[PDB]
Design a protein around this nucleic acid. Structure first.
Ligand code: CA
Length: 579
DNA sequence: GCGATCAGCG
DNA sequence: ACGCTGATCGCA
């Protein structure tokens, strides 16, 4: 029901200088994944190509790599990365429908071309799921069925660029797509393909040391409990703590006794088993997720792990990292921080370089709220967390511990993002009136923050959405719900999303500007990871001194706010040493 | 599959 | 009853 040429060879008219292009990779994780078909739509027609002959034809490969041949796509990173694993370069992508849909409305959950096409009442295309199936029934269909799906996806992209660009323009989101998210998409593709080298000897070692330590605390738990049970079973553990040992019940969940670490922490005066259970879980988490989990996904030939940075998932514009998640590698406790010693440079005589923004969201907030005292604090390069730790624990700066700072840090963000006296009282372990008094006092010093929280909630009611500094948008329909709980959650999104989303916008512009600077200085240094406000590179050790002056500067100059941006940086033989 | 839990980001 | 995530695992 849609005409196309099912072609056996490439022909000149498939190589127009503007085209819609589908390079279909069905596997969720596209690293080293099969390309199952190709589709091209342009002014001359609609063409399906088998990847065997199209990716071995030199004129088509040259066309893919030619930045003056403009391609419209959906999820161009997925194609770019799977082609890099075939040794082929994709350039010249000028429209990515996925990033366009994500900017217009992140809550859509746009997972394929059909979902995006629905936003514009376009439905001559099927959902990817209706064509490939789900779970164990997933399959590439017969070639005539596959080719019409890929052609229909390309025809949709061909038709939907224009209405998507015009609504982005009306939203002021068009330079955000073309100058931020699409260039970033090429950079993430490079980072994902490059990968991070892992020392599997050091990892496999730590695991054996953990298996020993697990059993020791495991046996001390069974002895302290006076019996053995399934320590990971909330059923049995609940029975042990709150029925056998008859510990106080401080919280329930929808299924029973809560055993979350905040609970166990408040039970430590009552019994010694609770602290051992905490130690057990911690060691189990390192064993399950970071030792075993990491070793699963290392490619054994190269010893590299290849994350996937999801660019159209978070409702604020942050990235997320999947399989492995490289944005939540342990750092806080010393035992878990050692996992970062396994993250090593990919060549000999190279180093890891890490640079990160200091309190990026409070600096964004100070700029957006224009709060006099908060701006003055950052113009003095104050460390708000340490100052807040002093005011909390009535200690002096010399006697503020990283433990004390971590708590003060959660107080600083919590207050500006709407924590209640109740929640603050439970975090500090202080009275509910003291918590409320602490909060009202905090807003005495920063009344501009308070006005901002009120104004942005009112502006979300009137407009229906909040925006960030580079015009990312999040719709908040629940801001007017009559249900109190639902409306509250939406008001706290209004306070948080513009701030966190603007921090994401800043780091994303930093990565683009940093890649340009690296190129024109002709350094081999390249990006490996982004961790929300932190950039990790690897580079030949003789580039380190230059990078110490280049990366801080590029990050500090990404945007210009009414307070300075502060960047801290380290380098070393491993990711662990780069702090 | 879901949700409680915990690792990270602020 | 601060916000944004992803992985693991028991399932009450
Ligand atoms: Ca930081």
């Amino acid at each position: 029901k849609m005409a196309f040429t099912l072609a056996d060879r490439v022909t000149e008219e498939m190589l127009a200088d503007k085209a819609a292009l589908v390079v279909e990779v069905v596997e969720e994780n596209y690293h080293d994944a099969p390309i199952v078909g190709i589709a091209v739509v342009n002014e001359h027609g609609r063409f399906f190509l088998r990847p065997e002959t199209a990716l071995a034809d030199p004129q088509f490969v040259a066309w893919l790599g030619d930045e003056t041949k403009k391609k419209s796509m959906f999820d161009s990173k997925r194609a770019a990365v799977a082609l890099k694993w075939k040794g082929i370069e994709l350039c010249g992508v000028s429209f990515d429908l996925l990033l366009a849909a994500y900017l217009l409305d992140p809550a859509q959950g746009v997972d394929d071309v059909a979902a995006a096409a629905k936003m514009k009442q376009y439905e001559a295309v099927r959902p990817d799921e209706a064509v490939y199936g789900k779970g164990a029934k997933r399959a590439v269909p017969d070639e005539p069925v596959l080719a019409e799906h890929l052609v229909r996806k390309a025809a949709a992209i061909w038709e939907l660029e224009r209405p998507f660009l015009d609504e982005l323009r009306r939203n002021e989101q068009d330079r955000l797509l073309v100058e931020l998210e699409q260039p970033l998409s090429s950079i993430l593709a490079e980072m994902e393909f490059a990968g991070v080298k892992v020392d599997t000897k050091r990892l496999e070692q730590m695991g054996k040391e953990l298996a020993e330590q697990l059993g020791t605390v495991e046996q001390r738990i069974y002895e302290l409990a006076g019996q053995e049970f399934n320590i990971n079973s909330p059923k049995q553990l609940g029975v042990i703590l709150f029925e056998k040992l008859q510990l106080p019940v401080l919280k329930k969940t929808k299924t029973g006794y809560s055993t979350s670490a905040d609970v166990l922490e408040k039970l430590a005066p009552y019994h010694e088993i609770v602290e051992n259970i905490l130690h057990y879980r911690q060691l189990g988490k390192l064993q399950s997720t970071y030792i075993e989990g990491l070793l699963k996904v290392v490619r054994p030939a190269t010893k590299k792990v290849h994350t996937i940075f999801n660019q159209a998932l978070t409702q604020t514009g942050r990235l997320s990292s999947t399989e492995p998640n490289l944005q939540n590698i342990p750092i806080r406790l010393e035992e878990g921080r050692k996992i970062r010693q396994a993250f090593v440079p990919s060549e000999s005589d190279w180093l890891i370089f890490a640079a990160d923004y200091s309190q990026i969201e409070l600096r964004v907030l100070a700029h957006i709220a224009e709060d006099d005292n908060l701006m003055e604090a950052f113009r003095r390069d104050l460390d708000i967390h340490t100052k807040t730790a002093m005011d909390i624990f009535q200690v002096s700066e010399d006697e503020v511990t990283p433990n004390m700072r971590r708590q003060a840090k959660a107080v600083n963000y919590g207050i500006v993002y709407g924590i209640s006296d109740y929640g603050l009282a439970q975090n500090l372990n202080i009275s509910r009136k003291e918590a409320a008094e602490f909060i009202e006092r905090y807003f005495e010093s920063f009344p501009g923050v308070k006005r901002y929280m009120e104004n942005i909630v009112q502006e979300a009611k009137q407009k229906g959405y909040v925006t960030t500094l580079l015009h990312r948008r999040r719709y908040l329909p629940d801001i007017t719900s009559r249900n109190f709980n639902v409306r509250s959650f939406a008001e706290r999104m209004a306070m948080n999303t513009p701030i966190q989303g603007s921090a994401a916008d800043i780091i994303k512009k930093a990565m683009i500007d940093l890649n340009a600077r690296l190129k024109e200085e002709r350094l081999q240094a390249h990006l490996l990871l982004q961790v929300h406000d932190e950039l990790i590179l690897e580079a030949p050790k003789e580039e380190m001194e230059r990078l110490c002056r280049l990366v801080p500067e590029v990050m500090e100059q990404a945007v210009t706010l009414r307070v300075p941006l502060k960047v801290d940086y380290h380098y070393g033989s491993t990711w662990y040493d780069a702090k």
